[PDB]
């Protein structure tokens, strides 16, 4: 279906010669930072807690105190993208290369967010308190996947089951001559009859029982008929000066 992509930008530890005693487990020190992201459904009130829905991640550690980064963080997105989520990123401060987060941690960011697909990033930047996080994100449809979800799914196709390449919201469109829900039905000739003609190629006009001509809408007077016309088929209808069923029968000489 689609992919969350998002990257992480300038974060400034905003610490003084205060103390963040979070780091120096045993005075200013480096503060080995690391992050942790939940993407979560819409809350109206979002929780950090984790049971974390659209999916979680933890990050090696990325930076020492205050830094930034020049790549992205790939989540796969495997259904409908519903456009409105929650976003719940931490920093955290740890001793060792563990990870996976009590405190030992930095700061946390959690937003509601509404977010349209396409490539074009969205930028962000959460500064508050004693941190300064600088972000992008989007979501990118998976290919042959297009539409305001990434939910339709659309290959170009010129076949036996169908004829049409793929718009731009994924939406077939079916190939010149050809029409119908899944391109299947091939347009018949501009003019032609819409009950005694069918069309079984995108470019004919078939006439059926009784009619013929170029668009099927002349019909076939009875065998034999000579001077005279059909209203419906095999009808046989003497003109001026002529009787009989083959109208042959003149009245003059």
């Known amino acids: 279906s689609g992919v969350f992509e998002l990257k992480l930008q300038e974060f400034v530890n905003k610490k003084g010669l205060l ?3 979070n780091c120096c487990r045993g005075p200013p020190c480096a503060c080995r930072t690391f992050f942790r992201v939940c993407l979560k459904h819409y809350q109206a009130s979002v929780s950090p807690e984790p049971p974390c829905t659209y999916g979680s991640a933890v990050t090696p550690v990325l930076g020492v105190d205050s830094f930034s980064l020049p790549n992205p963080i790939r989540f796969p997105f495997g259904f409908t ?4 989520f929650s976003l719940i990123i931490e920093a955290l401060h740890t001793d060792s290369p563990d990870l ?11 937003t509601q967010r509404h977010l349209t697909v396409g490539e074009e990033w969205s930028q962000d930047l959460h500064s ?3 941190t300064d996080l600088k972000y992008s994100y989007r979501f990118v449809c998976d290919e042959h996947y297009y539409g305001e979800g990434c939910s ?6 010129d076949d036996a089951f169908g004829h049409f390449t793929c718009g731009e919201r994924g939406e077939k469109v079916c190939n010149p001559g050809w029409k119908g829900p899944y391109c299947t039905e091939p347009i018949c000739l501009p003019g032609c009859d819409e009950q005694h003609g069918f069309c079984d190629k995108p ?11 170029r668009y099927c809408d002349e019909c076939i007077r009875y065998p034999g008929c000579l001077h005279g016309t059909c209203q419906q088929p095999w009808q046989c209808n003497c003109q001026e000066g002529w009787g009989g069923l083959f109208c042959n029968q003149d009245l003059n000489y």
Request: charged share 25%; with cysteine; hydrophobic share 25%.
């Open 128 to 130: 508050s308190g004693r």
């Open 81 to 84: 993208w519903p456009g409105t």
């Open 19 to 21: 103390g963040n005693r």
């Open 152 to 157: 339709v799914f659309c290959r170009p196709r």
């Open 203 to 213: 470019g004919e006009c078939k006439c059926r029982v009784g009619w013929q001509g």
């Open 100 to 110: 996976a987060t009590p405190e030992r941690l930095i700061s946390r960011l959690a």
